[PDB]
Design a protein around this motif. Structure first.
Motif, PDB file in Angstrom:
ATOM      1  N   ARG A   1       5.813  -6.488  -0.293  1.00 40.79           N
ATOM      2  CA  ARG A   1       5.332  -6.684   0.574  1.00 40.79           C
ATOM      3  C   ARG A   1       4.166  -6.281   1.684  1.00 40.79           C
ATOM      4  O   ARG A   1       3.514  -6.775   2.945  1.00 40.79           O
ATOM      5  CB  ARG A   1       6.878  -7.126   2.043  1.00 40.79           C
ATOM      6  CG  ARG A   1       7.462  -8.537   1.164  1.00 40.79           C
ATOM      7  CD  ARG A   1       8.146  -9.011   2.441  1.00 40.79           C
ATOM      8  NE  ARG A   1       7.095  -9.963   0.786  1.00 40.79           N
ATOM      9  CZ  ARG A   1       6.978 -10.906   0.825  1.00 40.79           C
ATOM     10  NH1 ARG A   1       6.328 -11.830   2.202  1.00 40.79           N
ATOM     11  NH2 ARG A   1       6.684 -12.316   0.307  1.00 40.79           N
ATOM     12  N   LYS A   2       4.351  -5.288   1.275  1.00 37.89           N
ATOM     13  CA  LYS A   2       2.688  -4.384   2.217  1.00 37.89           C
ATOM     14  C   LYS A   2       1.096  -4.968   1.420  1.00 37.89           C
ATOM     15  O   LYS A   2       0.409  -4.493   2.032  1.00 37.89           O
ATOM     16  CB  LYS A   2       3.459  -3.018   2.457  1.00 37.89           C
ATOM     17  CG  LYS A   2       4.090  -2.194   2.897  1.00 37.89           C
ATOM     18  CD  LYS A   2       4.043  -3.066   4.381  1.00 37.89           C
ATOM     19  CE  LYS A   2       5.873  -2.516   4.719  1.00 37.89           C
ATOM     20  NZ  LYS A   2       5.288  -1.150   5.319  1.00 37.89           N
ATOM     21  N   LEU A   3       1.486  -5.751   0.049  1.00 37.11           N
ATOM     22  CA  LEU A   3       0.578  -6.131  -0.506  1.00 37.11           C
ATOM     23  C   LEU A   3      -0.051  -7.303  -0.121  1.00 37.11           C
ATOM     24  O   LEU A   3      -1.610  -7.615  -0.563  1.00 37.11           O
ATOM     25  CB  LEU A   3       0.607  -5.468  -2.024  1.00 37.11           C
ATOM     26  CG  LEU A   3       0.270  -4.431  -2.670  1.00 37.11           C
ATOM     27  CD1 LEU A   3       0.377  -4.181  -3.397  1.00 37.11           C
ATOM     28  CD2 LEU A   3      -0.490  -3.283  -1.987  1.00 37.11           C
ATOM     29  N   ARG A   4       0.579  -8.184   0.885  1.00 39.43           N
ATOM     30  CA  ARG A   4      -0.287  -9.354   1.728  1.00 39.43           C
ATOM     31  C   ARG A   4      -1.118  -8.916   2.238  1.00 39.43           C
ATOM     32  O   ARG A   4      -2.251  -8.107   3.467  1.00 39.43           O
ATOM     33  CB  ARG A   4       0.924  -9.780   2.055  1.00 39.43           C
ATOM     34  CG  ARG A   4       2.332 -10.265   1.181  1.00 39.43           C
ATOM     35  CD  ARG A   4       1.699 -11.184   0.394  1.00 39.43           C
ATOM     36  NE  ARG A   4       2.141 -11.925  -0.359  1.00 39.43           N
ATOM     37  CZ  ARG A   4       2.367 -12.308  -1.626  1.00 39.43           C
ATOM     38  NH1 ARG A   4       1.613 -11.364  -2.663  1.00 39.43           N
ATOM     39  NH2 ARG A   4       4.060 -12.351  -2.604  1.00 39.43           N
ATOM     40  N   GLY A   5      -2.913  -9.878   1.829  1.00 40.49           N
ATOM     41  CA  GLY A   5      -3.654  -9.891   2.115  1.00 40.49           C
ATOM     42  C   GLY A   5      -4.773  -9.179   1.958  1.00 40.49           C
ATOM     43  O   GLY A   5      -5.737  -8.564   1.766  1.00 40.49           O
ATOM     44  N   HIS A   6      -4.562  -8.100   0.909  1.00 37.28           N
ATOM     45  CA  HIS A   6      -4.888  -6.839  -0.217  1.00 37.28           C
ATOM     46  C   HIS A   6      -5.408  -7.831  -1.041  1.00 37.28           C
ATOM     47  O   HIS A   6      -4.654  -8.807  -1.981  1.00 37.28           O
ATOM     48  CB  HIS A   6      -4.680  -5.925  -0.213  1.00 37.28           C
ATOM     49  CG  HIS A   6      -3.437  -5.123   0.622  1.00 37.28           C
ATOM     50  ND1 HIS A   6      -2.489  -5.115   0.835  1.00 37.28           N
ATOM     51  CD2 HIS A   6      -4.613  -4.221   2.350  1.00 37.28           C
ATOM     52  CE1 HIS A   6      -2.769  -4.233   2.098  1.00 37.28           C
ATOM     53  NE2 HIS A   6      -3.996  -4.522   2.770  1.00 37.28           N
TER      54      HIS A   6
ATOM     55  N   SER B   1      -7.006  -7.333  -4.760  1.00 36.52           N
ATOM     56  CA  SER B   1      -6.691  -6.596  -5.977  1.00 36.52           C
ATOM     57  C   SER B   1      -4.528  -6.691  -5.691  1.00 36.52           C
ATOM     58  O   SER B   1      -5.144  -6.076  -7.251  1.00 36.52           O
ATOM     59  CB  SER B   1      -7.310  -5.499  -5.864  1.00 36.52           C
ATOM     60  OG  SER B   1      -9.000  -6.116  -6.021  1.00 36.52           O
ATOM     61  N   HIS B   2      -4.586  -6.413  -5.128  1.00 36.97           N
ATOM     62  CA  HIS B   2      -3.160  -6.150  -4.717  1.00 36.97           C
ATOM     63  C   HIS B   2      -2.947  -4.908  -5.664  1.00 36.97           C
ATOM     64  O   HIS B   2      -1.796  -5.010  -6.188  1.00 36.97           O
ATOM     65  CB  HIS B   2      -2.447  -7.361  -5.894  1.00 36.97           C
ATOM     66  CG  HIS B   2      -1.140  -7.523  -5.467  1.00 36.97           C
ATOM     67  ND1 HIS B   2       0.249  -6.431  -6.218  1.00 36.97           N
ATOM     68  CD2 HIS B   2      -0.453  -8.738  -4.700  1.00 36.97           C
ATOM     69  CE1 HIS B   2       1.020  -7.215  -5.686  1.00 36.97           C
ATOM     70  NE2 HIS B   2       0.566  -8.342  -4.690  1.00 36.97           N
ATOM     71  N   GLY B   3      -3.621  -3.889  -5.266  1.00 36.96           N
ATOM     72  CA  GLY B   3      -2.837  -2.569  -5.666  1.00 36.96           C
ATOM     73  C   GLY B   3      -3.032  -2.449  -7.215  1.00 36.96           C
ATOM     74  O   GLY B   3      -2.616  -0.805  -7.749  1.00 36.96           O
ATOM     75  N   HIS B   4      -4.521  -2.568  -7.846  1.00 34.81           N
ATOM     76  CA  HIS B   4      -5.250  -2.871  -9.026  1.00 34.81           C
ATOM     77  C   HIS B   4      -6.247  -2.484  -9.285  1.00 34.81           C
ATOM     78  O   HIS B   4      -6.478  -2.693 -10.306  1.00 34.81           O
ATOM     79  CB  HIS B   4      -4.527  -3.755 -10.094  1.00 34.81           C
ATOM     80  CG  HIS B   4      -2.786  -4.166  -9.927  1.00 34.81           C
ATOM     81  ND1 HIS B   4      -2.120  -3.225 -10.818  1.00 34.81           N
ATOM     82  CD2 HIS B   4      -2.196  -4.992 -10.129  1.00 34.81           C
ATOM     83  CE1 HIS B   4      -0.837  -3.313 -10.755  1.00 34.81           C
ATOM     84  NE2 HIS B   4      -0.488  -4.422  -9.880  1.00 34.81           N
TER      85      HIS B   4
ATOM     86  N   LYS C   1      -9.591  -4.487 -13.816  1.00 34.62           N
ATOM     87  CA  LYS C   1      -8.588  -5.687 -13.120  1.00 34.62           C
ATOM     88  C   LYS C   1      -6.777  -5.649 -13.718  1.00 34.62           C
ATOM     89  O   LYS C   1      -8.010  -5.429 -15.357  1.00 34.62           O
ATOM     90  CB  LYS C   1      -9.089  -7.166 -13.442  1.00 34.62           C
ATOM     91  CG  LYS C   1      -9.891  -7.969 -11.975  1.00 34.62           C
ATOM     92  CD  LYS C   1     -11.220  -7.106 -12.233  1.00 34.62           C
ATOM     93  CE  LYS C   1     -12.883  -8.148 -13.598  1.00 34.62           C
ATOM     94  NZ  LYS C   1     -13.864  -7.666 -13.074  1.00 34.62           N
ATOM     95  N   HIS C   2      -6.345  -5.751 -13.081  1.00 35.42           N
ATOM     96  CA  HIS C   2      -4.959  -6.588 -13.253  1.00 35.42           C
ATOM     97  C   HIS C   2      -4.862  -7.368 -14.850  1.00 35.42           C
ATOM     98  O   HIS C   2      -4.094  -8.185 -14.735  1.00 35.42           O
ATOM     99  CB  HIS C   2      -4.261  -6.244 -13.140  1.00 35.42           C
ATOM    100  CG  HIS C   2      -2.448  -5.622 -13.305  1.00 35.42           C
ATOM    101  ND1 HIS C   2      -1.173  -6.495 -13.407  1.00 35.42           N
ATOM    102  CD2 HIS C   2      -1.858  -5.272 -14.914  1.00 35.42           C
ATOM    103  CE1 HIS C   2      -0.288  -6.227 -13.540  1.00 35.42           C
ATOM    104  NE2 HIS C   2      -0.792  -5.231 -14.538  1.00 35.42           N
TER     105      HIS C   2
END
Lengths: 210, 147
Positions: B8-13, B15-18, B23-24
């Motif tokens: 929910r905190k990764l919306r708008g980012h 690479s989504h924390g990866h 890349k993931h």
RNA sequence: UCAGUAACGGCGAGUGAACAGGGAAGAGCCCAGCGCCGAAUCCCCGCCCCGCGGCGGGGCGCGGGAAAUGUGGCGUACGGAAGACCCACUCCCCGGCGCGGGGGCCCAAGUCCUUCUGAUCGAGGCCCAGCCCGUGGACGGUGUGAGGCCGGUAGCGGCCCCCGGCGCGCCGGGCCCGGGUCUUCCCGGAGUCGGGUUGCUUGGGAAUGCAGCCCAAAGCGGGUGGUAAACUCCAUCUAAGGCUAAAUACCGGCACGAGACCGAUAGUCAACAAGUACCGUAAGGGAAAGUUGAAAAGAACUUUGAAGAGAGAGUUCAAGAGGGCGUGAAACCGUUAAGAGGUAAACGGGUGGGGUCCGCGCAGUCCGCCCGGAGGAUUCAACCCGGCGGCGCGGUCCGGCCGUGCCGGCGGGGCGGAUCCCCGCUCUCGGCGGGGGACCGCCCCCCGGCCGGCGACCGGCCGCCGCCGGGCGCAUUUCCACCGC
RNA sequence: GCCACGCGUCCAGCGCACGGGGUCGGCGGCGAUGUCGGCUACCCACCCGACCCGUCUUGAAACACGGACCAAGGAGUCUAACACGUGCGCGAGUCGGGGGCUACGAAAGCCGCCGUGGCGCAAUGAAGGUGAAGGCCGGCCGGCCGAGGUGGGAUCCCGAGGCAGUCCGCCGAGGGCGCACCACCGGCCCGUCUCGCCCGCCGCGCCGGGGAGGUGGAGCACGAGCGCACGUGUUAGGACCC
RNA sequence: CGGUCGUCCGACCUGGGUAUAGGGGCGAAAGACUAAUCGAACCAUCUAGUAGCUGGUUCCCUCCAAAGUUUCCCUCAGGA
RNA sequence: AACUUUAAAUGGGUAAGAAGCCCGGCUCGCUGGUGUGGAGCCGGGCGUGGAAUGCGAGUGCCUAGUGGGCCACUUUUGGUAAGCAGAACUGGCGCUGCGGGAUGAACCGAACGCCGGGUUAAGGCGCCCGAUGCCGACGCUCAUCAGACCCCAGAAAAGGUG
RNA sequence: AACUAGCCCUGAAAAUGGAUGGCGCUGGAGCGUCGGGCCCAUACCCGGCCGUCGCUGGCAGUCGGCAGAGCGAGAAAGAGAGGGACGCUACGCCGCGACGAGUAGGAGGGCCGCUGCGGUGAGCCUUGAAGCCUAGGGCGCGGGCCCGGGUGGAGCCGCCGCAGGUGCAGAUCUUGGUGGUAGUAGCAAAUAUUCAAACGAGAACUUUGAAGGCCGAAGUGGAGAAGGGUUCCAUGUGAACA
RNA sequence: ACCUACUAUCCAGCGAAACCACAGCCAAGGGAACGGGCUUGGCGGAAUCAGCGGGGAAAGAAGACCCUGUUGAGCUUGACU
RNA sequence: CUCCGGGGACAGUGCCAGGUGGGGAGUUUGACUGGGGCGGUACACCUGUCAAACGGUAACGCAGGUGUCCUAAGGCGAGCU
RNA sequence: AAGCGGGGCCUCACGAUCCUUCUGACCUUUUGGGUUUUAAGCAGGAGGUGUCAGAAAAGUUACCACAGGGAUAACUGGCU
RNA sequence: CCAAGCGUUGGAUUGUUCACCCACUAAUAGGGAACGUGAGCUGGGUUUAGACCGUCGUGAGACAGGUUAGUUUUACCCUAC
């Protein structure tokens, strides 16, 4: 790709396991179905007990469980022969009978015969026809007091015997439990070699003499 | 609670924390425990020593029922019988030592780990240790074998 | 549960049981062979009697056939068969008849007064039965929101049919049966087990299991005892024949109930004339597509145009709901109003100008305290009576109640205890299970003695204080109204 | 010019203010159909600044790739396993999850003589197996003390003192018991290596065991786990999506 | 499609019927044809096959804040 | 550079006390002319806290992303040289906006919450363009290819009675 | 006479027109050495506001006729006894200082937003719900939110917890719709049409007559097979196609 | 160089498609090393028509030429099984 | 007393065992590299230098060596240079 | 004799798992018990992976295919 | 030396760049503009798929070794003229 610290895991999910998935939503409905058929069976055998025929006193194999006592498949023929009950008639009066069981011991043989003796006293037998009560049936007043028995008939309770506090004698005080345990360990291990050693030693004495 | 999770905190980012360089991807290092004698050698040695190889004798038809020999120490020896018997044992002037049947409570072997109170006992057990016997004899007790 | 265990695995990735235990359920049996009974057995066809949508049973067949190349009865490893001696009841079962489930029809109470709306199921009320029923206030429909308008719902509610049933009685019936002791007999499944080899498989690893080929058995025998083999003790069953419900599974079908599920690009491909339109020779591929209004009341009639299309008029609460019609966004286009326009347009910061509506501003604050004078009251303080509340160290008033407090008991109960006489059974005393009794411990109660409390929990009397209500007290007291700029 | 005001004995109120952050006990105008005010949001003008976003990259405005515009849909989810941290209940115990008994309710409650069983409570060795302190005294036995020590250690204890004369509390040089935890030295359990002295039984040896010193163990040395939930991370699964 | 071209009595052209079906057919031989598909036709399924390789990965604010370096890996666009 | 008698600067270890000194005494199976030597245990006495400056320290788990780098002064390898390739220290860009160098990843100064006043850094003060519109100082220079500011964006040997 | 050092010149030649940045500058606005004065970046100082960090700071003392208004104090410790404003959702309030960049990445706070469930608001609602539009008033740094106006006709929201198929600008993303291009490319293969009359509202294309042409018997003729399946015939229409 | 037919031209009628970050005047400089946008300059005036091929590193297709992938296929053999 | 002839316990079939077997099936064909290929190993070590006076420090940088050999060329003692 | 030596005066000359072989024991299991072969264990050496932290491995494609790479070549433009 | 104002040709051979020769001429100078110029033209050669020859390879095939035949798309958009 393992992380810094963790386990080595072997998940058994490399087959097509998603097709063979057994959910358990039938369990609350299954319990009602088990109960309704059990209650319907009890009303069919309304004078007879709901558990069914009696079960013998049974010692366990697999020494882990050898001090426990269960309820068994059926009474042995030796146990019925001592109790004076024919094997083809015991099944009609609610006695579990199987010819596979043995009787190596006497205590368990006598325990089931004693169990059968108190079952015959507690058994209220209805006459074949109500007009003509036969010899081996119960009295007329016992007809009016016949009731269903809930739960296992004569439950087998693993009862333990109490012992009173005794004064230690000198034989118990001077006994060496560890030394006896170590000694019996060695002789069982060295039984065959000593028997073999004494075997050919007679033929060295015969050859020396002759 | 998906509202409390990280996504929910990764919306708008983007690479989504990866990360943007690494890349993931799907499986960069291989599936499962791949590379034990290979690119995952260090993790398999610095954290799991002894993983690769055979040692010992094979045993084809092993039954765990045969090896069942539970042990009890001398710490919780008086906990087997009730507390009432412990009070009356020291109270009795005749010296009648109470009997603690170890097999009755569900243990077979007795180990001499702990201290025993100074009052005689009669211990019935399937097996005994050497140090467990001398502690019982040191109080003035008896070791009784039973099968 | 064993257990991600024993075990298998370029012993790597990975794979991976079984015993025992606790439960659900629990039902056992039948042949061949061995033998005894005079084939004592069975099928078909014809006749009689009785029911005949399952032709059923019984009786008659010098009627036919099957069967001695073996049917039927006794009999199956738990032993069985025959004979002698005791005991024991002789009554089980087929085809007939008469003496709750499914379906159908119904069962309570407002359309009661006022008020809105196009329509009420919207709002208020129906006092002393705060309308009425309620074992019925689930749901749906009825012109928005309804327990009482209706279908329904609840009810061990009512009424009417069908189904076999459970047991009674009558007859057509088969039906003379077994158990214990002693004696004599008898008894087992073959190209099958097993071994060699090969292939597949299994956790099974010097083949766990299955299969092809070859060899190929025995009867104190054979198989198994998770390392190949030899010797010797044991342990456990009786293979190479067969039947059998329950616990169990169920994305098809029939009929259901339900949902922290999705809401026409979602949910089955398919909410709709959906496996339809359509495509490919074929195997097959495979859509898009819900909504007028409460009721069509679906626009009568007049007029222009050839008509499509308009303009009046009319329906409706609303055509700004006018036939692919509820709500009608954006991209895009047309038109009206305003502003602007040679460095493509657009943007940030700072101003300025013009519109837009808003402040409902246009004479700018009131609130307390004191003074003045005009007024108007039933009016103040202080006493009397009644009620209520608070507090109290009442130095410790009296009485209740409790203890997540203790002590006492010629106390009682209910229990528990791994503290110590009697009823019954397998060998009158020794052994065993159960029930005392006593003792100890806990809880409850009868109390009694302290401690604490009633501020997680209290009442009465006494004292003080406060408030309210009523009498007086009656106007230099008290309370309202008005202005000074 | 003065931060100096008394005696003897011995060797306090009033005002002012360069003072712990602004007040005026100061004023002038215009305000009913043409005037006041309205940051932002509507439009326009000027100055300054100002290259189109996303992504790969050491480097993007790039003559590096996607991209006319708009609406809807659209991508770290679920199961299982594990590790750690946190919250809750119980506690050397903990747990029914499987099974029974009593519309929502397929819920909830009850059954431990339904705790079988899972984890923990004991480890070590390939296995047979073994399996967790000692000291003193008297003559291998009989009594006693009986659960290691050192250093650092938050906290707690005493009171030399000091806030005519007692009590409360204060703090206090200094002196101690020392929680958890760290470092070290020791002690005990299992396997292995080396060295011995020995004793002893139900069957006296190629027997059974003890002792001393090193060494290996995921051990003991006065427990800490169990059950549920949450978050992160790594996996097997379709596994963030194409 | 137009002009220009080869052949046009025989290895000539053509209709219908029939046979050969995919690791197969058939080929006066070009890896040519096999229903606009041929260095292995088409349909459905396994299958949402795998990808260390491209693209994308959705609300705000606050706080902290990098690395392209060691060793190993048939390791060099990747992992530990 | 693969030579060295010498031999720097820069640099790399250690010490600047309370866990330090000075005593007295026990134990040892270690070593033995000799309580010889060593080590470990205790008990006791010494605080002017033993250089400067600055700063609260220590410690345990889980853990993403990263593992293509580049540029600048100095040293230096290969190459003629390269905006070439490969190294050493430090700082930057990557990850970072701001003022200046006309512009500009690496230069100079200086790092950033939203504002008002003041003052500067580097740069500048004829106009664009804020600032010299100073009564600026001292000299040099005429180009018919003048010159004008680190990075940095262009020049040599030689010659001139300018 | 020989050297030497400054400014300038020759050495000194590339292709679109061309760059001390341009204009231009020669008692420099060039060069070298240097003075005062002036210009200003988010740099420094002061002052206001927001947030973060630290003081692991302070506040239960609101102790009032049962009273006494204090712990701003340089100095280990005691104002110890024989009728009265606010406050304090202690997850709250208040005071001091310091700091504030940011890619990948991590954490925290959301009275930011969507959907459904259990509670809760004697919640809103045909005297007008949701949705949509809006040149209005505003709030919050921001995600967003509340009123004013219009349309709309039937549901909806606030708070405490629970749960997820929960937030789009891109993926040569999917579906659907609409633009510039654009009234543009184009309606050009096989010689050719003309006049009069009829009908009709409407005639280049319909019908009839006449004229001029083409196919030129291997046809643009007359009939078949395969294939098509009512296309064949009469009447009517100019809704859709030609 | 000239002539003919059908176009292209205009008009009556009917009428798309590719492509499209925004859109489009240049010189030099720097920049990711060939700019329409940035800097300094030259400059710049509605709406359009018929041509035209210099530019938009023009449109067509995730370069088939080269290399990497522990990605494949057709074929060969003294590669392994 | 085989329907006639011709073979005949041999062909031939089933199961094993050995040979052959790109006819056919599956798979592989390392890495570094001033693109790749080719050449080399800078892929495992050691010496001097690079290397900037602790240590460490790169390039397909330079000069070289190595996958041994020794019953002694090992270990003491003695005597010589 | 003090002493020195558990290889070569020093700086280098070598190899994991699994499998096999040898040696060492008055050692453990071989499964219900006993004896003997056999087999499996403990410990210590050896048989090698030179791509030397260790896969079992020939070519061609001009008929070629896919994911990519301006990290990497052939062309222009840049630096020398 | 000033000087790019104006000119620098027609042909045999070769795809050619380059090169050589014939003739004329005042001379037959050297070059750039993505080694100017393919939506301006050509496809002769490099450089696919079919083939022939020489060399190499057992083979499939390879040859900056020759020979032969081998589809050259689109402006109607913006700018420039």
């Amino acid at each position: 790709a393992p992380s810094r610290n963790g386990m080595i895991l072997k998940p058994h999910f490399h087959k097509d396991w998603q097709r063979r998935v057994a959910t358990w939503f039938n369990q609350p409905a299954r319990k009602i179905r088990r109960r309704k058929a059990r209650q319907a069976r009890a009303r069919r055998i309304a004078p007879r007990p709901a558990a069914g025929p009696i079960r013998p006193i049974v010692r366990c194999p697999t020494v882990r469980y050898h001090t426990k006592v269960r309820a068994g498949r059926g009474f042995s023929l030796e146990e019925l022969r001592v109790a004076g009950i024919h094997k083809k008639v015991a099944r009609t009066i609610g006695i579990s009978v199987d010819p596979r069981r043995r009787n190596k011991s006497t205590e368990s043989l006598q325990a089931n015969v004693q169990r059968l003796k108190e079952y015959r006293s507690k058994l209220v037998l209805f006459p074949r026809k109500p007009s003509a009560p036969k010899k081996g049936d119960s009295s007329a007043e016992e007809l009016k007091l016949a009731t269903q028995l809930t739960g296992p008939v004569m439950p087998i309770r693993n009862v333990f015997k109490k012992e009173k506090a005794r004064v230690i004698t000198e034989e118990e005080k001077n006994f060496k439990a560890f030394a006896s345990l170590r000694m019996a360990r060695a002789n069982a291990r060295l039984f065959g070699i000593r028997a073999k050693r004494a075997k050919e030693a007679a033929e060295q004495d015969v050859e020396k003499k002759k | 609670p998906s509202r409390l999770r990280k996504t929910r905190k990764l919306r708008g980012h983007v690479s989504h924390g990866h990360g943007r360089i690494g890349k993931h991807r799907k499986h960069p290092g291989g599936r499962g425990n791949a590379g034990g004698m290979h690119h995952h050698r260090i993790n398999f040695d610095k954290y799991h020593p002894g993983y690769f190889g055979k040692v010992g004798m094979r045993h084809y038809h092993l039954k765990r029922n045969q090896s069942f020999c539970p042990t009890v120490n001398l710490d919780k020896l008086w906990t087997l019988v009730s507390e009432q018997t412990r009070v009356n044992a020291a109270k009795n002037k005749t010296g009648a030592a109470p009997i603690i049947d170890v097999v009755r409570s569900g243990y077979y072997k007795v180990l001499g780990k702990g201290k025993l109170p100074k009052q005689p006992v009669i211990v019935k057990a399937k097996f005994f240790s050497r140090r467990a016997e001398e502690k019982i004899k040191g109080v003035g007790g008896a070791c009784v074998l039973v099968a």
